[PDB]
């Protein structure tokens, strides 16, 4: 996260760290959506241009974390993966269309002060909140600058951007399964996700029922926090039918 700040304790109890077993390193962010299901970006698991194709046994999920590198004894919980599910129409060849994947845990994780699932949006909440100017929140342990690394989880609030502005900011083909967020050059304020934040959640707090909903997944961006560029996020509601299909079939 670039130009964000340290998270408060328990601020984002759905935040998950995707952790590579060997070598031990941060792979991606992710989010807890039930006691056995974790949501992330497909490109965290599968991205052939970078020779990335992880299997279940390659990875661990670390939940309840604050510190990036510490083993947070008596606080974090570490889960093994039973199965990865990548969207069948995930487009890694072109523009990361449908950049979404689910991971089923081998055992349920116990909820605590530090570990708690985020809601997924239904149609009405999505329609109400996914509006240009409305701000969401992005969290992660990714890089602090495009070109070091944070001691603890970082947070930044960013406004959703009008779709024509998103489109005009890039040569990449944008789809309805994406939205973009961030400040404009004229707006002064800054901030963006970056490398290592991928798969993490873009959340919004509904003013109707005061619950946090995950509207987006950190997906892609040209550099990090560049003037005139924006962060792009997987549109979670647009892909919720796939999410529900997988959980209904395999959960």
């Amino acid at each position: 996260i670039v130009e964000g700040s340290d998270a408060e304790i328990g601020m984002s109890p759905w935040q998950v760290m995707l952790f590579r077993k060997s070598p031990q390193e941060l792979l991606c962010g992710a989010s807890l959506i039930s006691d056995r299901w974790v949501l992330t970006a497909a490109h965290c698991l599968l991205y052939p241009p970078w020779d990335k194709n992880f299997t279940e046994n390659d990875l661990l999920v670390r939940i309840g974390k604050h510190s990036r590198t510490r083993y947070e004894r008596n606080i974090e919980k570490i889960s093994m993966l039973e199965k990865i599910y990548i969207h069948p129409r995930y487009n890694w060849r072109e523009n990361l269309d449908r950049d979404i994947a689910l991971m089923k845990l081998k055992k349920p994780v116990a909820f605590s002060d530090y570990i708690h699932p985020v809601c997924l949006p239904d149609r009405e909440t999505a329609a109400s909140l996914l509006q240009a100017g409305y701000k969401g929140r992005v969290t992660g342990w990714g890089n602090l600058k495009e070109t070091g690394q944070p001691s603890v989880l970082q947070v930044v609030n960013l406004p959703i951007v009008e779709r024509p502005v998103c489109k005009d900011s890039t040569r990449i083909r944008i789809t309805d399964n994406m939205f973009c967020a961030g400040y404009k050059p004229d707006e002064g304020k800054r901030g963006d996700a970056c490398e290592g934040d991928s798969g993490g959640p873009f959340v919004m707090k509904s003013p109707f029922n005061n619950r946090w909903y995950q509207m987006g997944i950190v997906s892609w961006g040209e550099g990090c926090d560049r003037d005139g560029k924006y962060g792009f996020y997987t549109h979670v509601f647009r892909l919720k039918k796939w999410i529900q299909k997988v959980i209904d079939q395999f959960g």
Binding site: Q24, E25, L60, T69, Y71, I78, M80, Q149
Partner: peptide
């Protein structure tokens, strides 16, 4: 750069 995690999670 990361603290070692308990062996039980690597088995």
């Amino acid at each position: 750069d990361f603290e070692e995690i308990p062996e039980e999670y690597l088995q």
